[PDB]
Amino acid sequence: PLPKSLKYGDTIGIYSPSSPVTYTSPKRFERAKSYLLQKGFHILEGSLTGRYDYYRSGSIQERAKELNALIRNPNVSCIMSTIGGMNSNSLLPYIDYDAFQNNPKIMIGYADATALLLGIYAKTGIPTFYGPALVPSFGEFEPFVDDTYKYFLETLLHDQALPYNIKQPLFWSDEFINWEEKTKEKELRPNNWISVTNGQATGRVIGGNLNTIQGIWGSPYMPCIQEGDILFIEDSSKDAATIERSFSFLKINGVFDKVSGIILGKHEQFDDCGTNRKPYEILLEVLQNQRIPLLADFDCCATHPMITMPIGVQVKMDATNKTIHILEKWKI
Amino acid sequence: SNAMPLPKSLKYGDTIGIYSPSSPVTYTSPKRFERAKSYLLQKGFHILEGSLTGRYDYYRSGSIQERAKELNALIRNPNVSCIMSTIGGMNSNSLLPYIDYDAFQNNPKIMIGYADATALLLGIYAKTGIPTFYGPALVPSFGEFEPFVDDTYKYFLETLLHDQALPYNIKQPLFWSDEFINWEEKTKEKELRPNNWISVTNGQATGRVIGGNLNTIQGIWGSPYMPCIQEGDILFIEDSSKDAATIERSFSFLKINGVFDKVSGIILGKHEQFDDCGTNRKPYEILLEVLQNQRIPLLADFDCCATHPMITMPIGVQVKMDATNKTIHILEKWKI
Numbered sequence A: 001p002l003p004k005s006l007k008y009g010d011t012i013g014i015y016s017p018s019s020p021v022t023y024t025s026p027k028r029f030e031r032a033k034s035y036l037l038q039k040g041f042h043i044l045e046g047s048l049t050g051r052y053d054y055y056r057s058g059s060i061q062e063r064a065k066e067l068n069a070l071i072r073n074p075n076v077s078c079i080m081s082t083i084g085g086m087n088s089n090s091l092l093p094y095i096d097y098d099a100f101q102n103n104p105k106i107m108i109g110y111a112d113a114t115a116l117l118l119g120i121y122a123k124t125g126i127p128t129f130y131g132p133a134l135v136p137s138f139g140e141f142e143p144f145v146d147d148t149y150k151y152f153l154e155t156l157l158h159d160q161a162l163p164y165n166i167k168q169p170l171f172w173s174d175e176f177i178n179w180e181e182k183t184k185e186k187e188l189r190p191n192n193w194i195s196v197t198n199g200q201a202t203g204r205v206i207g208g209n210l211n212t213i214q215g216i217w218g219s220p221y222m223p224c225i226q227e228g229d230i231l232f233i234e235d236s237s238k239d240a241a242t243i244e245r246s247f248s249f250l251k252i253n254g255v256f257d258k259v260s261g262i263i264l265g266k267h268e269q270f271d272d273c274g275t276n277r278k279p280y281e282i283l284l285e286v287l288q289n290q291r292i293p294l295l296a297d298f299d300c301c302a303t304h305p306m307i308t309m310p311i312g313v314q315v316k317m318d319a320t321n322k323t324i325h326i327l328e329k330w331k332i
Numbered sequence B: 001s002n003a004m005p006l007p008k009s010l011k012y013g014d015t016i017g018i019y020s021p022s023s024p025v026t027y028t029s030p031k032r033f034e035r036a037k038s039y040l041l042q043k044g045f046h047i048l049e050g051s052l053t054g055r056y057d058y059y060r061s062g063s064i065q066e067r068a069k070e071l072n073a074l075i076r077n078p079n080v081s082c083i084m085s086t087i088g089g090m091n092s093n094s095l096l097p098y099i100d101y102d103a104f105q106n107n108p109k110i111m112i113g114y115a116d117a118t119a120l121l122l123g124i125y126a127k128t129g130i131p132t133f134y135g136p137a138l139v140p141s142f143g144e145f146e147p148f149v150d151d152t153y154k155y156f157l158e159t160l161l162h163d164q165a166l167p168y169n170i171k172q173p174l175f176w177s178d179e180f181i182n183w184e185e186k187t188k189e190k191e192l193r194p195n196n197w198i199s200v201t202n203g204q205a206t207g208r209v210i211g212g213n214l215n216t217i218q219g220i221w222g223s224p225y226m227p228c229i230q231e232g233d234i235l236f237i238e239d240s241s242k243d244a245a246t247i248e249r250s251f252s253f254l255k256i257n258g259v260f261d262k263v264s265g266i267i268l269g270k271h272e273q274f275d276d277c278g279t280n281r282k283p284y285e286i287l288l289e290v291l292q293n294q295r296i297p298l299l300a301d302f303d304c305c306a307t308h309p310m311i312t313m314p315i316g317v318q319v320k321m322d323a324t325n326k327t328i329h330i331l332e333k334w335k336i
């Protein structure tokens, strides 16, 4: 069971499972919609679009209803979060997994939406996509939005012969500017994926936003991590203390006794608490010299631009030579 | 309900060993640290300062291995009767693979603290079956100025040192505060707010109490260091200094894990400095939305959290909670 590839003229349904961004950042929201409309995709606005309930878009029931309406709509080919926040996991008991399994669609987003991407995969076995959310990703100004868009097409729309090589972008940024309105150009940071621990691994890739995983761990909505899986994790806009807790959470759960390799995303606006340590160095301390191939600063996180990564399919990573290939089909 | 290994009661003149499993508070808040030690020394206890006392590694007291060594030296020391965290932070869970649980099992002690120290309290209980205590940490709890420190000390003594007939009634404190003042130095008196517990959903429950700091539980969940929640348990949870979005996440985390299908009742701590995000909702109101149509007896604003004063609560022993009448009784021995 796999979702159909996106096509020009398709409808993308958008929903707000957590923060009410369509109310609080209307300019970036409108820009994001226009960007995709111009590319050739229709936008179906979920029922909580424009609504405000302070830290969230609406009640648990209303958010589940918003998403379920899109799941059940045969005219929708792709379901995309508007943004994350903290509260997507509240929806999980109430989602119509059977409707999704009977008519698979592309489910895409990142950050807090991890709860839903992993929950849908766990319940249905259908691959989901760690990738753009409407407002942060497609509301981005030039130049980075165009790079994110190229990666979006590469994974969801283009015919891709396997293995599918995921290529490193030339430049990136995590600069905290140009949210609603553009005031200057973001700096172009020359890119590098980091060969932290050499080696190669092949296996099913599982993961997403690590902070968010801790809100679903142990539940029926968290796919079981199996011996030989590849772990993909990122955090964004946290600090050294928080990520040490999260890395140790994985360690004490035996995750590093099972996975064959680790892909670690860049950490947007990382606060190192004065230590001058990088996120991978904190992970290395937690690993205590266990030799697991580890490739870091992967561009699939809150930094721009963003790759669209299938979750739940076989991948091969090479931490030595800094490559990632998708080995198993993820769409029709 | 067979008799089981229990730690020995605290006695006057006992040595309390202190360690810093996360934040380096003994370096960054020296006045409150000195005041806290001085408070317990005046009551006639001795303080053995762990090896990371006074040390500084930014967000933590030292490396993972340095912090495990610090705690293990106290665990292995037969002259220590009580092991108390200086403060929490975020990183206690890093220590868990490296703790000498065998040595603890061989010579049990009172293990006490709160907040991030939940990782260790629950880890020790999960690995050894010895009850541990959600209660004072040295600097936040015993560095508090009068009057609240005396109430916290009263509860500590009554639970850990005094003989208690069972069932043991946990008395409601008469006053409380969560004011963000008087940390290192006193500038005014904290308001003495008249206290109440809240009967959120009526009813009674009896069972083993399991829990602690909910945010911290998410850093150990699923591991050998989290005790399994069983049918009929009473869930004790608190969060401190968080916001509505964060606690909804944490309550839903419990829900989707089936915790509310198992527990017979819930005790919710006060929420120090809660940020309601403009909603004007109370933490229990958010929890009740997560509970949806499921009725569970619930007693809220319990004084076992970051607000002052603090009760000392044994974890892993049977309790009766009466949410209707706002009582908590401990039903099984927690020390000998």
Ligand SMILES: Nc1ncnc2c1ncn2[C@@H]1O[C@H](COS(=O)(=O)NC(=O)[C@@H](N)CC(=O)O)[C@@H](O)[C@H]1O
Pocket (backbone or CB within 6 Å): A019, A083, A084, A085, A086, A110, A111, A112, A113, A136, A179, A209, A211, A212, A236, A237, A268, A302
């Ligand atoms: N007001 C604003 N201004 C500028 N940038 C913003 C913004 N709001 C969002 N962004 C940007 O959009 C990204 C995604 O936002 S997010 O709400 O979905 N985040 C999460 O769900 C995880 N934190 C969940 C977790 O950490 O557990 C942020 O990292 C910023 O880059």
Ligand SMILES: Nc1ncnc2c1ncn2[C@@H]1O[C@H](COS(=O)(=O)NC(=O)[C@@H](N)CC(=O)O)[C@@H](O)[C@H]1O
Pocket (backbone or CB within 6 Å): B023, B087, B088, B089, B090, B114, B115, B116, B117, B140, B183, B213, B215, B216, B240, B241, B272, B306
């Ligand atoms: N610098 C300071 N100034 C004033 N009060 C302070 C303080 N530092 C601490 N406090 C007080 O001491 C309490 C406990 O701090 S703590 O580091 O142990 N917290 C935790 O481990 C959890 N947050 C882990 C989690 O939520 O995941 C705080 O709530 C304050 O009331």
